[PDB]
Design a protein around this nucleic acid. Structure first.
Ligand SMILES: [Zn+2]
Lengths: 25, 81, 129, 150, 157
RNA sequence: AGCUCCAAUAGCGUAUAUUGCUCGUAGUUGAACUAUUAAUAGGGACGGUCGGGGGCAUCAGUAUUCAAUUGUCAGAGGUGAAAUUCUUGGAUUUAUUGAAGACUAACUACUGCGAAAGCAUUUGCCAAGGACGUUUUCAUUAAUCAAGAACGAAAAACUAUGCCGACUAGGGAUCGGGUGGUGUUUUUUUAAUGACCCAC
């Protein structure tokens, strides 16, 4: 319960951090 | 009904109160030694008798049950107990 | 209808006492109720009681002064040992020294103080305070 | 309670304190045994037999005038019952009401009261089967009723 | 019952009778009738959103004369109720607090100097009777006595 | 003076999140007691009753509608006033019968009876039911019910609402039965020993 919630907070956080800006190569 | 002991209740109250709510439940009917002049015969009769009891020797109607206590037929000499 | 005879009798006495009468008709009787009234008498929670006999199941009459605050009966008659007597007394009764709880042991029907005195335990009936 | 109904009207005859014979009574054990067994050969119901005793024969109660109860007397003499008189009477009333239903089909009054009497009979037959004086496969029907009352 | 003229006429239906013995409109009404109508209109229209004290402050009168008035009025109402129920009539069913409302009270205008009901007894019946303090901190009370759960036994034993 | 003040000072803020009716089956509750009782537990019988309780015919009240017979001949109806309609082959109306199809008023309510919807003339026939009363019978056979079943005319509703209870006492009223007294009212060798007063 709490473990699932804390891992959810970390995972949603770092997913938001790994999504980034578009770029043309 | 005003207020009373429950231990040894007064005899007037034991008679006036319902016979199931008194201290020891018990009856109120009794028996009658009745004599019929058809043979000058004596019979033992219940006071709330449930059938038309007839005399042993002669065929005379003694009483018909009318509700609680019976009415003896006319011309029979009765005595309590 | 018939919930249990112990519950019926004790509801009758506590009802009439909290109203404030002085003589109560409890009917019918039982030996567990007789010893219940006996221990309540010996701690002085009532006045004096009497078994009136009618040969089916007798009547019980009580003269009680004023002291019955509240007393009842537990439904699941479980097991207790003596540390559980401590925990149960504290969690059931009003306060620490107050009231009594009544036990059915191998030495029959008596409260927890004489029970701890005689070193027994058993099933539990109810409580008086 | 007034089972399968709603009243509280008490209909109970009380019981005396003393369990002996009264004084002015002058009839003996075997003599009332004679009268009860002659009544059993006549063919009435033991309840009514004790009734006509306490009306006519002065017997205040049969068990206390002879330490064996009325059913003990009948089982002793061999006049034992086949099914108890209460269930016999309920069966008779049930088959009478079924006859009324057959003659006048549209009587929902008789329908519902027939449902209630058969409920009562289911309960009482469950008891008589558990004590098992009754054969433990007694399954009531209208033909069984008409054969036991006819 | 959403209409405006209808219900005002409906609750003024006894006032116009009392001050008449039909001019029921708002121009042919004249005098005492009109005064009482205006009072009752503003009464309801302020009662729907006000504080009930300053809405209906009851006008002052010494204690024995007001109690004599309310005694006489309840006596008349009771004799009226008895004559109706003896020679069977129907009547408007009212709540247990207030009195009746008769042509007597409408004409004689007694509501303002006696009131709807005994306000003290009104608050008395509205408050909740005080029970005992909870000692039984473990189980559930029932007619059968205490019931203590096996959850509780697994908690304690 | 480098505006003023305050808090941590080896730590520190920010943000998110938190602390209908009745039967009845499982389950649940469920008399005293060391050929026992018979619980102001339950069933049963019997005696007298009670009821606009139920099914089946049966007899009847009026009213309405139609038909027919006679009466005098000029409107009848309905509405706020109107109108549709009927009314020289005699409308409506008065008298006579006749017939059909619904309802059984005044008595009618402070109620009775049914589990509920429901329930009002008569006499029969049939079959159920409550309560009373019994020194009558059995022997705990009782109870709360979820699933299943039976019963319920089926435009309807539109100001109504009083805390609740394992509930203590009560009072005047009723309805039904019994117990007793007391006199009336009754009547008496003949037919139903009923009504009223009061205490229980
Ligand atoms: Zn003779």
């Amino acid at each position: 319960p709490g473990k699932m919630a804390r891992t959810m907070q970390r995972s949603s956080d770092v997913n938001e951090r790994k999504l980034h800006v578009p770029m043309v190569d | 009904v005003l207020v009373q002991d429950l231990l040894h209740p007064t005899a007037a109250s034991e008679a006036r109160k319902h016979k199931l709510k008194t201290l020891v439940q018990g009856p109120r009917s009794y028996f009658l030694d009745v004599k019929c002049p058809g043979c000058l015969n004596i019979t033992t009769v219940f006071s709330h008798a449930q059938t038309a009891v007839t005399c042993e020797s002669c065929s005379t109607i003694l009483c018909t049950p009318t509700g609680g206590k019976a009415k003896l037929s006319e011309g029979t000499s009765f005595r309590r107990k | 209808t018939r919930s249990s005879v112990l519950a019926d009798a004790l509801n009758a006495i506590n009802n009439a006492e909290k109203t404030g009468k002085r003589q109560v008709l409890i009917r019918p009787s039982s030996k567990v109720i007789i010893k219940f009234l006996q221990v309540m008498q010996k701690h002085g929670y009532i006045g004096e009681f009497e078994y009136i006999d009618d040969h089916r199941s007798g009547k019980i009459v009580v003269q009680l002064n004023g002291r019955l605050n509240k007393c009842g009966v537990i439904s699941p008659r479980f097991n207790v040992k003596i540390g559980d007597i401590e925990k149960w007394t504290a969690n059931l009764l009003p306060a620490r020294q107050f009231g009594y709880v009544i036990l059915t042991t191998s030495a029959g029907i008596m409260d927890h103080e004489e029970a701890r005195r005689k070193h027994v335990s058993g099933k539990i009936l109810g409580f008086v305070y | 309670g007034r089972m399968h109904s709603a009243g509280k009207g008490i209909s109970s005859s009380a019981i005396p304190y003393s369990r002996n014979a009264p004084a002015w009574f002058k009839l003996s054990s075997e003599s009332v045994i004679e009268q009860i067994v002659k009544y059993a050969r006549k063919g009435l119901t033991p309840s009514q037999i004790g009734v006509l005793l306490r009306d006519a024969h002065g017997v205040t109660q049969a068990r206390v005038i002879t330490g064996n109860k009325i059913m003990r007397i009948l089982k002793s003499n061999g006049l034992a019952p086949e099914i108890p008189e209460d269930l016999y009477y309920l069966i008779k009333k049930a088959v009478s009401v079924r006859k009324h239903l057959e003659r006048n089909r549209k009587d929902k009054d008789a329908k519902f009261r027939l449902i209630l009497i058969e409920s009562r009979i289911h309960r009482l037959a469950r008891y008589y089967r558990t004590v098992a004086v009754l054969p433990p496969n007694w399954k009531y029907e209208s033909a069984t009723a008409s054969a036991l009352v006819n | 019952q959403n209409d405006l003229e209808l219900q005002q006429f409906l609750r003024e239906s006894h006032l116009l009778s009392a001050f008449n013995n039909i001019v029921y409109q708002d121009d042919q009404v004249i005098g005492k009738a009109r005064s009482r109508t205006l009072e009752m209109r503003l009464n309801r229209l302020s009662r729907v959103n006000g504080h009930q004290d300053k809405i209906n402050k009851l006008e002052k009168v010494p204690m024995h004369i007001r109690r004599g008035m309310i005694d006489k009025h309840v006596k008349r109402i009771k004799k009226y109720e008895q004559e109706a129920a003896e020679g069977g009539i129907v009547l408007s069913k009212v709540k247990k607090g207030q009195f009746r409302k008769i042509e007597s009270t409408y004409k004689k205008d007694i509501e303002r100097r006696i009131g709807g009901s005994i306000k003290a007894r009104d608050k008395e019946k509205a408050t909740k009777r005080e029970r005992g303090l909870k000692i039984s901190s473990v189980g559930r009370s029932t007619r059968n006595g205490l019931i203590v759960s096996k959850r509780d036994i697994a908690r304690i034993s």
